[PDB]
Design a protein around this ligand. Structure first.
Ligand SMILES: O=C(O)CNC(=O)C(=O)O
Ligand SMILES: [Mg+2]
Ligand code: NI
Ligand SMILES: [Zn+2]
Length: 331
């Protein structure tokens, strides 16, 4: 068995190996990369996502989200308070202001210590989930707006044609902006490219151990757990590496820098934080190996998780017994 300790693997494809996206995912899996839940892919030196980032300031963040925390430093929830619209140029200035800027630090480990000590005492503002792309249309390799769609993959594997579309999303971050513990919708893969700016630190639980994280979360968030049998689908709960280690939960960590891709694998729980002003692009995707995870994915039916149009068909075809209850949650 490849990668039996479930370590995060880092890949350096050549320009030839960067041509065929599906083939390279399958290669990484042949080496055991999925067992970690997360892999890093460093593009060949010949590649670029676009020519420059000099002309992005007029992109609109229609609904910036202020991430307000409740709880204790290592075990907290966050809720998202909607703020007034602002441009990317306005958001960048805000991120760099004395109230929000990254503090002085020695290295990534010192900054990680400061994040976990102090996150809950501040409310950073995140531009998340903005439909769009920063890849140049002429970039033919690993262009996250030109991937094979999940609807086409389901059709190719199972023979059933379905409605829905699959497009990328932009994230504009600042120091302390936070992504809560989650797996993807329908336990899909995700791919994330850090276009510019400061790093993103990730934490991940191997898919084979995801139910250990879920049992800890039910213990640590007992009201939320009574409310919903899949409350991590709400994407609000944070648990620190120190708390995970105290409770024996297997995990790994890695820092993504500008110019790097991360892939999350089906049922790989992940969480993390941004170091300072940055911009990332991410999308979900599927492979043949995903289908069995899609059929078994938990679902939120309490009303909180509310998701895209395109999840309807995935539930309807892969999980027909759950469909009626899930759809009630959507309505
Ligand atoms: O970058 C972020 O805020 C969160 N991203 C992801 O969870 C991802 O790419 O799967
Ligand atoms: Mg612009
Ligand atoms: Ni994710
Ligand atoms: Zn729920």
């Amino acid at each position: 068995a490849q990668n039996p300790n479930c370590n995060i693997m880092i890949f350096h494809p050549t320009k030839e190996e960067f041509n065929d996206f599906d083939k390279y995912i399958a290669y990484m899996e042949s080496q055991g990369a999925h067992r970690a839940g997360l892999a890093k892919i460093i593009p060949p030196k010949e590649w670029k996502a676009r020519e420059t980032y000099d002309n992005i300031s007029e992109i609109l963040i229609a609904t910036p989200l202020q991430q307000v925390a409740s709880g204790r430093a290592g075990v907290f929830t966050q809720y998202h308070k909607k703020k007034k619209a602002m441009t990317v140029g306005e958001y960048r200035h805000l991120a760099n202001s004395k109230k929000y800027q990254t503090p002085p630090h020695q290295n990534f480990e010192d900054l990680e210590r400061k994040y976990w000590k102090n996150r809950i005492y501040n409310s950073p503002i995140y531009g998340a989930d903005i439909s769009g792309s920063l890849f140049d249309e002429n970039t033919k390799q690993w262009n996250l707006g030109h991937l094979g769609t999940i609807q086409d993959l389901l059709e190719k594997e199972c023979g059933v044609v379905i409605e829905g579309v699959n497009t990328p999303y932009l994230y504009f971050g600042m120091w302390k902006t936070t992504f809560a513990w989650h797996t993807e919708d329908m336990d899909l893969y995700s791919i994330n490219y850090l276009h510019l700016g400061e790093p993103k630190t990730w934490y991940v639980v191997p898919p084979e151990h995801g139910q250990r994280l879920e049992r800890l979360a039910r213990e640590l968030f007992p009201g939320s757990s009574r409310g919903c049998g899949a409350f991590l689908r709400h994407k609000v709960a944070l648990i620190s590496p120190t708390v995970l280690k105290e409770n024996g939960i297997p995990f790994n960590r890695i820092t993504q820098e500008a110019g790097e891709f991360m892939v999350t694998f089906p049922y790989g729980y992940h969480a993390g934080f941004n170091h300072g002003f940055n911009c990332a692009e991410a999308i979900n995707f599927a492979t043949p190996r995903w289908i069995d995870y899609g059929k078994m994915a938990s679902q939120c039916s309490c009303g909180e998780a509310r998701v895209t149009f395109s999840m309807d068909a995935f539930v309807r075809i892969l999980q027909p017994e759950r469909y009626d209850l899930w759809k009630r949650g959507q309505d």
